[PDB]
Structures are given as structure tokens and as C-alpha cells.
Design a protein around this nucleic acid. Structure first.
Lengths: 180, 79, 75, 136, 126, 182, 116
RNA sequence: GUUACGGCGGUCCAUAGCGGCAGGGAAACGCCCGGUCCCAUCCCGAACCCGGAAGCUAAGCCUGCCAGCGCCGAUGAUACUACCCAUCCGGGUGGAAAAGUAGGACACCGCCGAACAC
């Protein structure tokens, strides 16, 4: 299973600095830095609307193709500086990738189901760090809580890993705690 | 009521008296300090109060030596 | 080790009585505190001290209810 | 009421009400949370009343976390006294709450009752606040 | 398999020797006009260098390796006096009369003291 | 020449036996007895330091060395202890005196203590270094028994080049220590 | 306490000196010294070593002494009685096992006094 | 001049360390053999020192393998910030610009000597 690397335009940044960044964010753009094994970082201006659409529709760890002045460069979303209050994306650190890279990311774990009525489920891990090729990063990693009594420490090694993915976290990592 | 505080010592005017590049005579106080936040090096000596003084003329050079911050005096070559 | 600091040593002779076992070792018991009993041993002569039980003589691990009681009691 | 077992300095300067919060800006503990939008000293009484309001609006079921401890003293001079004659003795214990800081967290099944409980808590609180989610 | 647990006495000796070498070298340092006569002493041999620690360079070296001193029918102290004589005359050739003796973190005695006394006799000043 | 009995026995047969039981790639990995230490910790000397001299005399007459009087590192309110006071007489033993004392100990003193049901082989620090203890001093023939007014035990440790309890136990039993089978 | 054949158990006659051992009284001393060829009217200062050796080996071959006997006693008590026999219950509670007035005078077991 | 090398030093003294797992003993460094001699242990020839050359690279030391732990670590962004604009927005300008993070970075340099070469 693969993921269609979402398309985006990426104008390069002419003036770099906090003034230029703020003017861009007022213009609706997003400052980003594309780096990786490219080893010659590019400073870019994405569009906030479509970038946020990509992120909220394909999670954070999303592959994406960047029309960088005609060239279509493949990249990953490595990190995001989002404001706490506004919750607007302030900056995007993007990772150059290619076919068969086996990148490492921090994917969204998602609990689902419902246990016995006489218990409660507490998520200790928002996410799980994994190794996988950069065209099959899951949007989510699901886990089930149907028919699990109290005292069932669901850890990270007990997860249903897809094909190709490889845990880099430890199996001791507690993910969900089922309690009274 | 009343406060049991209110005391303070006299300010000792510690610090660095001759910074980097400052040309100094011998015996010039470079660093007033209590311990050895600044250590002595080339043509610099340490007094009883851990004060650093030039042992020779030159321009003060702040350097490092095995993690310690040092104060050195580099000679000023006459023309 | 120093000359005077330390006590006096000399090769003396450990004699077992149970076995006649015969060792030679230097000990603080010497011309100061030996049993006043010399004998020749080897190319020299040493004083003795005697022992009741030794590694060779001693019964330790180098060299060494109750239905049965009530059945030898009541046949 | 929360309170520390000890403090190295009982009489402290007022915490600086400036800057957006750099830590605790997110959930990290539960599903729904209270985020602050103003600067304020949040006290023991406020924290306990809001916790209680949650625990009464919804009962056995779900969990609550309090991501702030009021370990910052605030002194009070006696009343009917002149200025001076020393700094007052500690009266209040607060937590300096910058905007963005998540204060309360919970995990409960129904978003409706959870959000309503958090609303009760916010009304106990002295600041404008906000519901936030672990998801985004 | 095997796995020794404590650091050997060789490691202890090396690290301690280096410690006390650096200890005395806090005070001792060599110059082109007063070089540091630094000693190294094994159980088999002895070695000396004349160092100008300003540039970290050696001016003249001597040792109990070379045949002219290894051929002596005597003790390590005899080898040491010969090494002191050699480094003295080599230093004189290099234009040195006065040095400062770095005993390399060793105890000043026996072989090292004999070497030093021999160089003192041969002309070096310390 | 005139080597100690235990030492000539060691480097004649025990080294080879240890090699066989543990095939060592290098001869210098063979276990060997580094030293033995006799501590005579007498905490009852704090209230009166007149017992330390008897401890000294005893250890001297046993081993053959003036002991080192170990001054306290720390003051302890419960043990009635200040710093610097004489609590303990230590003797380190290396070389010929060590081998002689071990032979004396093994062949004389251990069978001379009352109800000697052996020494525990579990009493290893984890690095092939043994340590046991005694409750008195009359087990050593070197002392005149009439002159024993106060019992004074000790802690004897035998530290070796062994890297584990197994090799240490092999070495000690080969030397002839009484290790009961448990 | 230190020696079975204490080379000087105490300077006095042998019949009474051998009783300074946890498994020897007057009659065992007498029968020992009769089985041997040792006078009983002789002090321990006048001993020899061979005398001590024959005594030691006789004793170790025939009868029991301090450590082994004391262990036999304590093991008899604990094991052969049990946790919860009668004599064991009364050993446990520190009271006279063989049938005695506990009402007034069982002090040898009960201790000096605990008057309330 | 070359070394799986011995010393003496240096570095914004960690890109250098720790821990690996596989190796080396030419001279040397070393353990190592003994205490007769200088010397020595608040006891100990363990150490210090001295005299030695039986065997061993087992260890130290040294060489190669490394992102396992630690260390270094940009960029860009953010925070903070001097000046300025602005009638509360601590809003914004142009300058400076972190920490943390992430991408990525795993010893080097010099002098002498030794064996060999020559």
C-alpha cells in the first residue's frame, strides 16, 4: 500500500528573516525549509490553505510533491512550528526523500472500540515512532479496545504493524492503560 | 512588625578591569575575582585574593586551556 | 618489613600429634615464643610447636518421630 | 487545595505576567483540555473549584489531570497596617498561567459532557479560556 | 570466554605517573633558553628529551637504546649516567647550559638521580 | 630454593589444574593469590582505646606484621564514635608471609576452631575474592592461650586475580580450603 | 567453646575437668578415664599430649560433645516436637513442658518476674 | 621515507569520550621474576625504589570496524531584544538573534626517538 504524494507549489524565499516570514504569513503563505540529504537547504513559501488541507487530510507525516520552480521535488513533513493560540502553521521543516529511503517518523496512534462498561481507557502515547519507506507511511496506526478487561497494559510491541513498517520504539512503551 | 533582614556587604568592585586588546603595564590589575573563574596564563600571576595581574606588558588576551578560561598577556612588538 | 616495627619470625616446625603430620613454616612463635624443642629438618634446624588437630587429622570434609527408633523400640 | 510540601524561598517576587507559554501548550495527557488565553495567577481555590466542577458535572467515568501546581507564593501584608515594616507573609499559592498553557485535561467518552464540564471549570476560572483537543 | 574486572596495575601505574607528571609540570615548563629535560623510565631502559614547550619541540634526545650505552657491562644506573653524559654533550652542541629537570612523574632517585647528577657533572645546570 | 610449601604446590600443580578446569587462552589469565587481609575491626575501642593494643598484639603474633591502626573515617552518634579514633587493626599480607599464613591457617587454625562444620563457598564478593570471619583468636597456636583475656575475632579476606567466584572457589579449594558442599 | 579437648579446660582433677563439656558429667568422666589408662586424681597441668589424643579419639568415637550435641538438642526440640505439639506449644510460650505448677512457681522458664 | 609504535606536547580539551567486537608484540611500552644493594610501606618489595630477563601480549598501550550511550550541530523558524512607528492592540517596522529540536557531524596536528628502509 502506498500514498499519493500530494501536490504543492513552493515559491522560494527571496528575503529571509522574521519580517519576511511575518509578511508571508500575512499574505497567507507558510515559510518552510526543505533539507535532508539534499545538503543545500531551500527556503520556500508554501500556501497555508492547501498545506493545512494536506496535513489535516493525510496527517502530519505526509509525503508531498513540491513544484519548486517547475521542478517536482519529493519531500516529507518532518516538523511543524504551529502557534499555540492561533493554531496557525508558522513554519514547516520538510525532509527530502526518495524511493526506498526508510525514513523514521512519529505516527499518530489511534485507539478505537469500547471495553467493558466497568473500566476506562487512558492513552499514554499520542504517537509512536517508527521506521518505514517514504511512500507507505500510515496516516494512522490503529489499536482496539474491544473486550479488554482492566489491567491490560497495551504497549507498542502489541500493535498490529503493517508490512514494511518497523518499530524503533521499545515494546516496553506503554500506549494504552485499561483501568477501573 | 519588623524585618530580620536589612544587611548587605560593600560592593567589592570585582570584575574585569582590562578587557581583550587593552594594552597594560606590568602589575596592572586585569581581573578582580574571588576564585578562578578566570585562570592565570602567559605572563599573568595570581594574587592572594585570586586577583590576576600582568607580569609583563602586552595586550590582554582571553583564551581557554583545558576548559579553564585563561587570561594571557601577549607581547606588543615594538616597531 | 621494617626492622624493629615487626615481630620476630623464623621457620618453625608444625607437629601434629594425632597423625604425626609434619609441616615447616615461618611463624611468630620463634626463638621468642616457640615451644623450647629444636630438631633438625632439612639442611637446617628449627624449633617445634605442636597441634592437637590438623587438616589431615581433623574429621572435616577432606578426611572424615524416627519410626526407626520406635521400631527398634517396639519391634 | 493543592500546596507544596516546601519551598526554598517562601517570599518570592510576583511571577512575570508576560509572554506566550512555551510549554504545556498542548494536551499530552488526555483527550479534551482547557487552554488559557490570558495571563493570570491561578490559585489553589480556583484549581480545586474547577476540578470539583468537572467531577460533579460528570461522575465515575473518565479521568482528570491538572497540569499546573500552584507553587508560587503570594504574600499579604496584614490589614490596617502601614506600608513598610517588612514583606508580608505568604497567604496565597498560585501558578503563573501564560496564554497557551493547558491547565486542565480530561478523558471522557461523550464530547458533550466533557466540553460542558470544562465550561463549568472555565466559569470557575478567572480568565478567558478555550477547549482544545489532543487530535488538533 | 574471559573478562577481567579490575584495571591492571600497569594501567594504574601509567595513569598515576601521568597524573604526577602533570602535577610537577604545572610548575615546570621548558623554553629554548631553559629547556625541559623530560625523563621516561622503563624497567629496561631510560630516555630523555630536551623540550621547548613553547612550540612543543624536542631539541636533543638521548636513551639507553643505542649501542654506545647498551654495550656497558654495568647496571641501569650506569646506563643512566651514560645517558646523562650524552644528553649533556648533545645539549651543549645544541647551545644549552641551563635546563629544568622534569622527572616524568617518577621519584627522583636511583637511575633518574644518577642521570641528573651525571648531566650536572657534564655541564648542565640544575 | 626455600619457597613456601603452599606456593611451590601452587605453581607446581594448582596452576595446571586451574588451566584444565578452565582452559585459559593465556597463562597470565591464571588465577593467583594477590593478598590476604586480616581486619580486626574493634568498635568497642571507641569507649576505651585500650583494647586496640591487644588487637595489635594478637594480629602481630598471628601474621607477623605490625598492623595498621585504622582511624575512623566518620563520627557516628549511635556507635559512640568520633572521627580519627582507633577502630580497627588491619594487616595486609603479600608474598611469602601470605603463603605461610595461609598454610598455617588451613593446616592448623580452621580445624582448631570449635565445631568446624566448614566454611561457606558462597562467601565471595563476585570477583573470585573470598572473605570469611572468626569470632576469637585462640585458634592460632602462636598465641599463648592463658594470655587471652578478651575474645577478639577478625575478618580474613583472600583477594585473587580471579575474575569470578567459580575460579576463585576452584583456587581456594585447590589450596585446601574447607568448603562445605553448599 | 574453643576446643573439645581443651588443652587446659581448667587446672584441676580430670574427673571434674572433663565435666567442663556439654556432654560429660562425673560418671562419663569416670568411665572414660577407666576405659583409658589415665588416673582421675591428676590435674590438667600434669597432662601430656598423647593423653589428650586418646581422650579426643575416644570421645569422638563413642559419645557426643558440645556442638553436635547442642545441635541435636535444639533439632530434637524444634523438628521432633513440631510447630504445634503440646510440649512444643509450651516450649514456644516459655513454660514448663513436663507438667508443673504454672500457677505459682515456674520461674526458671518464665523469667525473673513481670509483676503487674 | 614506511610502520597495527615509543615518548613529549597542542586543540574554543568530547567531532577527541565511554562501551563495542576482531586484532598486534620488530625495537619499544608493558605486565612479569626477585629483593643483595640506594630507597620504601602510618602494615605490606602491592606501591615507591633497585637488580633482572624465565613467558605473555591476558591486560594496559596500539590498529581497524561505530550515530549503541554521551559530545558537536548548522540552516530556517520561533522566543527574547536595542532603535523606530503606533492614542491601550505589548500590535507592527527595519536590524541583532537564541535555547530546544531536527538534518547531519566518530579525532586531528606538530617535535623527537625506535626498528626497518636507506
Amino acid at each position: 500500500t502506498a500514498n499519493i504524494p500530494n501536490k504543492l507549489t513552493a515559491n522560494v524565499r527571496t528575503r529571509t528573516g522574521k519580517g519576511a516570514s511575518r509578511q508571508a504569513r500575512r499574505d497567507g503563505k507558510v515559510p518552510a525549509v526543505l533539507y535532508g540529504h539534499g545538503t543545500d537547504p531551500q527556503h520556500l513559501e508554501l500556501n497555508a490553505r492547501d498545506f493545512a488541507a494536506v496535513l489535516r487530510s493525510h496527517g502530519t507525516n505526509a509525503i508531498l510533491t513540491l513544484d519548486i520552480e517547475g521542478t517536482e521535488q519529493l519531500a516529507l513533513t518532518k516538523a511543524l512550528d504551529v502557534h499555540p493560540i492561533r493554531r496557525n502553521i508558522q513554519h514547516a521543516d520538510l525532509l527530502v526523500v526518495q524511493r526506498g529511503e526508510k525514513v523514521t517518523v512519529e505516527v499518530t496512534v489511534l485507539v478505537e472500540g469500547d471495553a467493558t462498561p466497568g473500566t476506562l481507557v487512558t492513552q499514554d502515547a499520542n504517537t509512536i515512532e517508527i521506521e518505514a519507506e517514504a511512500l507507505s507511511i500510515p496516516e494512522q496506526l490503529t489499536v482496539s479496545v474491544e473486550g479488554v478487561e482492566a489491567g491490560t497494559q497495551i504497549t507498542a510491541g502489541q500493535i498490529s504493524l503493517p508490512e514494511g513498517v518497523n518499530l524503533i520504539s521499545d515494546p516496553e512503551l506503554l500506549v494504552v492503560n485499561v483501568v477501573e | 512588625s519588623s524585618s530580620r533582614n536589612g544587611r548587605d556587604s560593600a560592593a567589592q568592585r570585582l570584575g574585569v578591569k582590562r578587557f581583550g586588546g587593552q594594552v597594560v603595564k606590568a602589575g596592572e590589575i586585569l581581573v578582580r575575582q574571588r576564585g578562578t573563574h578566570f585562570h592565570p596564563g602567559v605572563n599573568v600571576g595570581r594574587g592572594g585574593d585570586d586577583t590576576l595581574f600582568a607580569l609583563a606588558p602586552g595586550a590582554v588576551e582571553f583564551g581557554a586551556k583545558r576548559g579553564r578560561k585563561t587570561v594571557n598577556i601577549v607581547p606588543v612588538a615594538r616597531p | 618489613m621494617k626492622p624493629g616495627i615487626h615481630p620476630d619470625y623464623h621457620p618453625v616446625v608444625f607437629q601434629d600429634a594425632a597423625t604425626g603430620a609434619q609441616f615447616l613454616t615461618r611463624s611468630t612463635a620463634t626463638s621468642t615464643r616457640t615451644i623450647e624443642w629444636p630438631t633438625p629438618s632439612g639442611p637446617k634446624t628449627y624449633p617445634l610447636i605442636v597441634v592437637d588437630v590438623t587438616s589431615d587429622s581433623h574429621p572435616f570434609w577432606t578426611g572424615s518421630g524416627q519410626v526407626e527408633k520406635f521400631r527398634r523400640r517396639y519391634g | 487545595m493543592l500546596i507544596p510540601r516546601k519551598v526554598k524561598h517562601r517570599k518570592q517576587h510576583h511571577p512575570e505576567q508576560r509572554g506566550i507559554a512555551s510549554g504545556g501548550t498542548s494536551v499530552s495527557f488526555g483527550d479534551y483540555g482547557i487552554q488559557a488565553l490570558e495571563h493570570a495567577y491561578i490559585t489553589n481555590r480556583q484549581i480545586e473549584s474547577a476540578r470539583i466542577a468537572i467531577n460533579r458535572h460528570i461522575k465515575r467515568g473518565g479521568k482528570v489531570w491538572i497540569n499546573i501546581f500552584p507553587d508560587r507564593p503570594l504574600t499579604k501584608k496584614p490589614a490596617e497596617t502601614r506600608m513598610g515594616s517588612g514583606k508580608g507573609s505568604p497567604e496565597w499559592w498560585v501558578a503563573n498561567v501564560k496564554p497557551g498553557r493547558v491547565l486542565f485535561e480530561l478523558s471522557y467518552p461523550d464530547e458533550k459532557t466533557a466540553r460542558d464540564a470544562l465550561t463549568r471549570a472555565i466559569h470557575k476560572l478567572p480568565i478567558k479560556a478555550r477547549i482544545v483537543t489532543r487530535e488538533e | 570466554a574471559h573478562k577481567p574486572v579490575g584495571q591492571n596495575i600497569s594501567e594504574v601505574r601509567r595513569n598515576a605517573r601521568l597524573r604526577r607528571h602533570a602535577r610537577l609540570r604545572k610548575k615546570v615548563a621548558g623554553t629554548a633558553e631553559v629547556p625541559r629535560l623530560v625523563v621516561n623510565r622503563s624497567a629496561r631502559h631510560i630516555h630523555v628529551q630536551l623540550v621547548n614547550d613553547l612550540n612543543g619541540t624536542t631539541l636533543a634526545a638521548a636513551s639507553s637504546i643505542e649501542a654506545d650505552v647498551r654495550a656497558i657491562d654495568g647496571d641501569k644506573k650506569a646506563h643512566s649516567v651514560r645517558v646523562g653524559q650524552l644528553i649533556a654533550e648533545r645539549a651543549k652542541a645544541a647551545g644549552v647550559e641551563t635546563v629544568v629537570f622534569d622527572r616524568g612523574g617518577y621519584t627522583y632517585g636511583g637511575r633518574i638521580a644518577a642521570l641528573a647528577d651525571a648531566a650536572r657533572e657534564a655541564g648542565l645546570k640544575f | 630454593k626455600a619457597l613456601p610449601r603452599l606456593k611451590q604446590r601452587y605453581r607446581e600443580e594448582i596452576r595446571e589444574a586451574l588451566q584444565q578446569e578452565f582452559n585459559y587462552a593465556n597463562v597470565m589469565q591464571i588465577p593467583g593469590v594477590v593478598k590476604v587481609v586480616v581486619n580486626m575491626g574493634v568498635g568497642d575501642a571507641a569507649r576505651d582505646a585500650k583494647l586496640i593494643n591487644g588487637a595489635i598484639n594478637d594480629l602481630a603474633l598471628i601474621t607477623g606484621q605490625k598492623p595498621e591502626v585504622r582511624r575512623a573515617r566518620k563520627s557516628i552518634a549511635q556507635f559512640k564514635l568520633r572521627e580519627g579514633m582507633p577502630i580497627g587493626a588491619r594487616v595486609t599480607l603479600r608474598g611469602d608471609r601470605m603463603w605461610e599464613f595461609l598454610d598455617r591457617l588451613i593446616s592448623i587454625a580452621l580445624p582448631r576452631i570449635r565445631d568446624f562444620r566448614g566454611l561457606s563457598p558462597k562467601q565471595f564478593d563476585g570477583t573470585g575474592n573470598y572473605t570469611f570471619g572468626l569470632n576469637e583468636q585462640s585458634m592460632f597456636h602462636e598465641i599463648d592461650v592463658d594470655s587471652i583475656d578478651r575474645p577478639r575475632g577478625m575478618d580474613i579476606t583472600v583477594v585473587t586475580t580471579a575474575t569470578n567466584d567459580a575460579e576463585g572457589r576452584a583456587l581456594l579449594r585447590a589450596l585446601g580450603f574447607p568448603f562445605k558442599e553448599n | 567453646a574453643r576446643l573439645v579437648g581443651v588443652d587446659l579446660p581448667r587446672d584441676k582433677r580430670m574427673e571434674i575437668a572433663l565435666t567442663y563439656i556439654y556432654g560429660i558429667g562425673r560418671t562419663r568422666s569416670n568411665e572414660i578415664l577407666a576405659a583409658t589408662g589415665i588416673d582421675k586424681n591428676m590435674r590438667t597441668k600434669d597432662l601430656t599430649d598423647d593423653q589428650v589424643t586418646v581422650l579426643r579419639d575416644y570421645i569422638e568415637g563413642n559419645l557426643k560433645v558440645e556442638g553436635d550435641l547442642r545441635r541435636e538438642v535444639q533439632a530434637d526440640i524444634r523438628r521432633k516436637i513440631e510447630i504445634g505439639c503440646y510440649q512444643g506449644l509450651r516450649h514456644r510460650r516459655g513454660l514448663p513442658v513436663r507438667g508443673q505448677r504454672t500457677k505459682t512457681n515456674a520461674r526458671t522458664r518464665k523469667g525473673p518476674k513481670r509483676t503487674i
